[PDB]
Design a binder for this molecule. Structure first.
Ligand SMILES: [Fe+2]
Length: 662
């Protein structure tokens, strides 16, 4: 048989190897020796024809060995393909996409994919058991802080497996751009070092972060209650807002407040009353920067949806009611300018804290990390489900360790400017585990329980729904090719351990929240994987992407507050200024909002990954349909935003990354 064996080397910097690599072809019936054929050239696809007398049959594996003489050289193998030039057979695909190190003999299965149940021959059975044992030695759980959901084991990036590390081409650009980014900002902001700081207009002096079309709008009108409430719907953090069924029990009224109660009852029966509650911030210890006391608040904001499709704030309560003590003052738009302005600033500051911590870090980065480690420890390379998820898990462990090394680590970024940093952030993050429910990660159920379905004013809910349907079908499409009966899913030990690693191990008992302990059906499994895929794409991008727009104008998103939240209604121009961050803190904030949210040097759009793990044409068809539905969504949304005054685009397949990486 005449075969053209083709081996593809990585496009990295250290991908090429000076060592000679020997291959072997082992099929359904027998195996053949090929020996040293070529030497891995960096970013070079190399093919060659060979002829073997021994009958192989269906090629199952392609074993390789990298022999080194005196100095070993790492080799990042993309894949190996061996096709029969004579017989009418399909090209045998053998995906690798990882680093190859050591004088150990590696084995690459064919890219078809299958499970233990779907492999009755037991051809790949022994292969996957030995691989997973090694996977577990490489991927272990760790604990950055006690009480939180597990993360990857280790402390530094060096503790991460080489395959999870940044490619040398991205690592240099990721760090360079970040360095030049914050320095440029630090330079210009140092000029204001002696500039007056007594009017809110002075905030415009430091403003020079990104200055986008939307970001300018914010500067133009942040004091507008219309934009204020608009952010609860389509802002950077649309997770807290929900439709009110009844008045919040913490919404207690001070003696005299009876007229306002009727305005609240009017909106409730109409079904236009909404509430965003920040009680999670209660009793969280605030930061201490330079021995100066910072302050937090647990506000409540009541809003009404206007017939012209506008959400407007009605009342803001800054403290939670103290049992046994008189009720705290409620602030209304009727209050003096400065008094209402201060209360909105406290709400924006608190939204920032919860956004970055819960919405972003926890619900986005850490959750994904949980999925990542559970995938690598329970699902073998050949597993069909494993091949579906991996692109979405790209560069996740790396960016997370980078965060726990200076972004949220002790004496890190939060501690330096964030009011929650310095202890309270962990307190807020640890206690936020209870709010992590299975339904909250699924749009069809999230907006359902909250009550944002059908709300035309909420573009997030719409886009979240549409996107979820597309993904859902893609997973259903892939899972359908490998799971035809519910018993298949039910008896998939690997699949069952994966789901176990997540709900029970990773998430520390998430069954009490809503996460399943076992996937017994096919439709249930499809919903779980979609939930995973969505968390590493949509859930993160819908929260990450708005940072450059809303958190750049400090007055709209204060990183900290120098004065405690007002207990009386007598705020003045100076007090608002004193409460808000000074030039020292605000400027640092802007330079840091660029870190937690920005455009990545090289970015991979949702569903647009290059690594090919499947070999069949059927899996590909499903992949192509997925890319098709996404493309048409990205265009339609683009057209829709034309008519929109403030275009919502945080869920567009073109800018929505395929994995959590920034
Ligand atoms: Fe992010």
């Amino acid at each position: 048989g005449v075969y053209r064996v083709c081996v593809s080397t990585g496009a990295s910097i250290y991908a090429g190897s000076k060592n000679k690599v020997e291959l072997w072809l082992v099929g359904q019936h027998g195996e053949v020796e090929l020996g040293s054929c070529l030497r891995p050239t960096r970013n070079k696809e190399e093919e060659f024809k060979v002829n073997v007398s021994k009958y192989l049959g269906s090629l199952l594996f392609v074993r390789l060995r990298k022999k080194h003489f005196l100095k070993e050289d790492a080799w990042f193998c993309n894949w190996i393909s061996v096709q029969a030039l004579g017989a009418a057979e399909d090209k045998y695909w053998f995906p690798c996409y990882r680093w190859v190190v050591g004088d150990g003999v590696q084995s690459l299965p064919v890219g078809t994919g299958c499970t233990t149940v779907g492999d009755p021959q037991g051809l790949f059975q022994k292969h996957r058991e030995q691989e997973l044992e090694e996977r577990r030695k490489l991927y272990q759980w760790g604990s950055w802080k006690e009480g939180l959901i597990l993360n990857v084991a280790g402390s530094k990036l060096t503790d991460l497996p080489v395959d999870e590390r940044f490619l040398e081409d991205k690592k240099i650009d990721f760090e360079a751009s970040l360095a030049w980014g914050l320095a440029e900002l630090a330079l210009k902001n140092s000029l204001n070092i002696l500039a007056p700081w007594k009017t809110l207009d002075d905030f415009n002096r430091i403003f020079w972060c990104g200055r986008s079309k939307l970001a300018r709008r914010v500067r133009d009108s942040w004091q507008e209650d219309s934009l204020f409430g608009y952010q609860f719907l389509n802002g950077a953090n649309p997770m807290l807002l929900r439709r009110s069924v009844q008045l919040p029990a913490r919404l207690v009224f001070p003696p005299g407040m009876e007229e306002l109660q009727a305005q609240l009852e009017k909106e409730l029966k109409a079904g236009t009353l909404f509430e965003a509650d920040f009680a999670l911030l209660d009793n969280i210890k605030a930061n201490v920067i330079l021995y100066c006391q910072q302050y937090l608040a647990a506000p409540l904001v009541m809003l009404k949806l206007q017939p012209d499709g506008k959400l407007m704030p009605m009342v803001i309560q800054l403290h939670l009611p103290k049992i046994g003590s008189s009720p705290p003052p409620l602030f209304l738009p009727t209050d003096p300018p400065m008094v209402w302005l201060l209360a909105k600033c406290w709400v924006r500051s608190s939204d920032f804290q919860v956004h970055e911590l819960n919405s972003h870090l926890l619900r986005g980065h850490l959750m994904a990390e949980v999925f990542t480690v559970a995938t690598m420890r329970c699902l073998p390379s050949i597993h069909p489900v494993f091949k579906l998820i991996v692109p979405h898990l790209r560069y996740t462990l790396e960016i997370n360790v980078r965060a726990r090394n200076g972004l949220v680590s002790d004496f890190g970024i939060f501690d330096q400017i964030m009011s929650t940093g310095g202890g309270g952030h962990v307190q807020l993050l640890q206690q936020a585990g209870a709010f992590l429910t299975y339904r909250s990660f699924c749009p069809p159920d999230d907006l359902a329980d909250r009550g944002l379905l059908g709300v035309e004013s909420s573009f997030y809910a719409q886009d979240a729904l549409r996107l979820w349907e597309i993904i859902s079908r893609y997973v259903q499409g892939i899972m359908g090719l490998y799971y035809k009966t519910d018993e298949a899913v039910r008896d998939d030990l690997e699949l069952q351990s994966w789901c176990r690693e997540i709900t029970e191990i990773g998430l520390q008992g998430a069954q009490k929240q809503g996460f399943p302990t076992s996937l017994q059906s096919v439709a249930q499994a499809c919903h779980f994987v979609t939930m995973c895929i969505f968390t590493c794409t949509g859930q993160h991008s819908s929260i990450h992407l708005g940072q450059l727009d809303w958190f750049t104008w400090v007055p709209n998103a204060p990183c900290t507050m120098r004065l405690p939240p007002p207990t009386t209604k007598d705020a003045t121009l100076e007090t608002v200024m004193a409460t808000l961050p000074n030039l020292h803190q605000s400027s640092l904030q802007m330079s840091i909002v660029w870190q937690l949210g920005r455009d990545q040097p090289i970015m991979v759009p949702l569903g647009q990954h290059q690594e090919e793990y499947f070999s069949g044409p059927e899996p590909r068809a499903v992949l192509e349909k997925f890319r098709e539905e996404l493309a048409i969504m990205d265009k339609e949304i683009e057209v829709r935003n034309e008519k929109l005054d403030i275009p919502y685009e945080y869920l567009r397949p073109s800018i929505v990354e395929n994995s959590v990486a920034i």
